[PDB]
């Protein structure tokens, strides 16, 4: 019978969660109390980029820590120069509804995705000066949300059909497919060694999947609401998730339960994007309250308000050397911060 | 320093191209199509012309309108509905040929109730404020054929039908029998009373009686967008 098997499964999950709760002895807050204060900073805008028309939905830095790409609701993507505020390239899209953007680690390819359920891959460096469409990837019955690059020929894409899958350029079909989420996933972060990854869904759960293993590796009980953005700690043994419940969390890979929670009484809106720094000492986040709230990775307290935008902020990201923090909002105004 | 000068020149060329794109982009209005599989939404879009979402364009009196037909993902519009916040209007299509005898396969009551619930969900959305819907009542020939064909009465599962009579504001354009005029205005008043429960004077609904093989829908959308923009302009300057 189905009922008996389901009930043994529920006792199995009950004893699993009992073991998980028994595998914890002391919180890190007491250990955190052994550290010195960090200091509050009023870092100001250095440069401002204003080229788009509609809202800005995604952005991605480069491997040189000075080039970046961003995607707008208008249907075009332009590559900025973070130093001299120059528009290196401009590419018009075929679909006007895109909500993700990526930049190749080798600085040769870009990726796009949206409600069209198609993943576009362009070729920045060609024989001709203009940029031409290289490959179109289809096969997802869901709107794309993340299109992070795994290598020069491997792309991992997140879609709204509750399934994530690894792809390939030359063959043009997905190699491996990962399933297990009930709701639609819209978050994805990679690892420094490009061997594992984590994803989040609206079902209030975070799932860690190994690329080589081929199926689910870890499952974490998330927040009380959806997951809007996720990020991976630079060390490689922890990560952080942001939700609409006006609070953020961070977990670790090895121990498999919650480590830290960030929340405040004043903040009520939902988190839109989350990022770390080079040393992982302070955590950056974006809210609907038009300000990019700066947090502390250890004390779990605020550092500075750091405002400057008029509308909802949707994306931000630090460079590979921690030199600047780009930030995109819904008013089509990029803001280089330092 | 010639490299920087050439980079600046390329930036100026890109800026000129972006200025041209902005000039082209500001003269178009975007509409959001919405409906159900049973309704002739495909028929409506096909008559309106003359794998992700579909896009179509049309020109009316030198005004360009972009219409986004929605053939899209799983039936949950909680996250992909946020991108539609600057659209001019929402065109909702409802099939008016679902009698109480055709209830459903295994899910709920008659499809009219499901359409009413869908319309209520669209109306009471949070991100969909300041947007006015253009309600449509499609598939009217079948209703007129079925009201007098027997073997199906909507009063069986709609007890409030016997208490309803045609209003004096009705227009006797069918010229056939007041039963069709009674049913038409019954369903129209039902949709209105579902609609006019909130809004606070920021958006309105415009019911219409149209057929799948109709031709004057173009003028209807033009006239409804005109008033929608005109009222907003009047309200912005404290003139309304």
């Amino acid at each position, epitope marked *: 019978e189905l009922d008996q098997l389901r009930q043994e499964a529920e006792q199995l999950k009950n004893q699993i969660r009992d073991a998980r709760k028994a595998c914890a002895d002391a919180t890190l807050s007491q250990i955190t109390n052994n550290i010195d204060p960090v200091g509050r900073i009023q870092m100001r805008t250095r440069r401002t980029l204003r080229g788009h028309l509609a809202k800005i939905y995604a952005m991605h830095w480069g491997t040189d820590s000075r080039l970046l790409v961003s995607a707008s609701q208008d249907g075009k993507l332009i590559i900025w*120069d973070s130093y001299t505020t*120059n528009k290196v390239h401009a590419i018009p899209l075929r679909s006007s509804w895109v909500m993700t953007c990526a930049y190749a680690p080798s600085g040769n390819y870009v990726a796009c995705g949206g409600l069209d359920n198609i993943c576009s891959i362009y070729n920045l460096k060609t024989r*001709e*000066g*203009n940029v031409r469409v290289s490959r179109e990837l289809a096969g997802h019955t869901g709107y794309l949300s993340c299109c992070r690059f795994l290598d020069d020929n491997q792309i991992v894409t997140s879609s709204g059909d509750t399934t994530c899958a690894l792809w390939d350029i030359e063959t043009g079909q997905q190699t491996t497919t990962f399933t297990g989420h009930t709701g639609d996933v819209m978050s994805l972060s990679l690892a420094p060694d490009t061997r594992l990854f984590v994803s989040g869904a609206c079902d209030a759960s975070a799932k860690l999947w190994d690329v080589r293993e081929g199926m689910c590796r870890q499952t974490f009980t998330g927040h009380e609401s959806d997951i809007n953005a996720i990020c991976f700690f630079p060390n490689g043994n922890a990560f952080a998730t942001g939700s609409d419940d006006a609070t953020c969390r961070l977990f670790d890979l090895r121990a498999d339960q919650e480590l830290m929670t960030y929340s405040h009484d004043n903040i009520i809106c939902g988190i839109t994007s989350v990022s770390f720094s080079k040393s992982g000492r302070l955590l950056l986040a974006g809210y609907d309250d038009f300000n990019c709230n700066v947090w502390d990775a250890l004390k779990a307290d605020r550092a500075g308000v750091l405002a400057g935008h008029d509308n909802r902020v949707s994306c931000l990201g630090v460079t590979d050397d921690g030199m600047a923090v780009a930030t995109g909002s819904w008013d089509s105004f990029l803001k280089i911060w330092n | 320093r*010639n*490299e920087e*000068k050439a980079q600046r*020149e390329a930036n100026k*060329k890109i800026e000129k191209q972006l200025q041209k794109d902005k000039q082209v982009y500001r003269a178009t209005h975007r509409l959001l199509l919405l409906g159900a599989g049973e309704s002739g939404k495909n028929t409506i879009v096909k008559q309106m012309r003359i794998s992700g979402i579909f896009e179509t364009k049309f020109q009316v009196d030198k005004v360009n309108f972009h219409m986004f037909d929605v053939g899209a993902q799983r039936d949950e519009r909680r996250k992909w509905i946020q991108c539609f916040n600057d659209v001019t209007a929402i065109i909702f299509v409802v099939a008016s040929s679902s009698y109480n005898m055709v209830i459903r396969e295994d899910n709920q009551t008659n499809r009219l109730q499901a359409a009413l619930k869908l319309f209520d969900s669209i109306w009471n959305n949070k991100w969909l404020r300041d947007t006015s819907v253009i309600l449509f009542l499609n598939k009217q020939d079948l209703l007129a054929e079925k009201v007098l064909a027997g073997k199906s009465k909507i009063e069986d599962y709609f007890p409030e039908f016997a208490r309803y009579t045609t209003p004096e504001d009705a227009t006797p354009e069918p010229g056939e029998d007041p039963r069709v005029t009674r049913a038409k205005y019954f369903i129209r008043d039902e949709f209105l009373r579902i609609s006019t429960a909130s809004g606070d004077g920021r958006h309105y609904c415009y019911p219409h009686f149209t057929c799948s093989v109709d031709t004057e829908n173009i003028r209807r959308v033009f006239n409804d967008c005109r008033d929608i923009i005109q009222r907003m302009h009047l309200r912005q300057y404290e003139l309304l």
Partner: single-chain antibody
Amino acid sequence: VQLVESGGGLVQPGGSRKLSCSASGFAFSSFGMHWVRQAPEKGLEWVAYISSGSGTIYYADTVKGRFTISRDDPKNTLFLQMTSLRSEDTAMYYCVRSIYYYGSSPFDFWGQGTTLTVSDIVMTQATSSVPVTPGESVSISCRSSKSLLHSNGNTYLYWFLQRPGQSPQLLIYRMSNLASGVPDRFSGSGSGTAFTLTISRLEAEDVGVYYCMQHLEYPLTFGAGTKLEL
């Protein structure tokens, strides 16, 4: 990528001539253009420069009143008019394309060229003929009268290594970046006023003439040139 050059020859002094360069196989509307001259017994020398959208038009410092340039994108033609010619301008003419952004490679592809026969920063090569063997190291020197470094940090220096019989190629640009189609057998280094080009392995394709050109100021002057004989 194809460049076809037409015009040139021998005409009486004082007349007017017409040169044309057509680009087929790529979109040149976003490529800056250069016309460069090479004397029969001397090295390369720049003549004229056209911006991407004709916003900037630059003429030779040695002579500019007798040169005029223009281009048409729909017809895909860059053409030159010369009036009242002298015996000085007796050099091969080349039309070259170059695009300028961050991380770009200026002066990538060169044309076949056409023959017509009738101070600023100075760079000279100490040597003129270096006899070597296929398997030893080859060193070529370059000296500049002024420090080529800029405030940004870019060392504007370019080598060509033109083969004796075909169009010049690009090997090392900005003194520290290698080209695409050049085999990994060349290297370059410098300090600001003394620069060197080093070759480890030699084959039959390394015979040619090497050039040293700078882009700090704008005389677009070139080096001397060294011929290799085996």
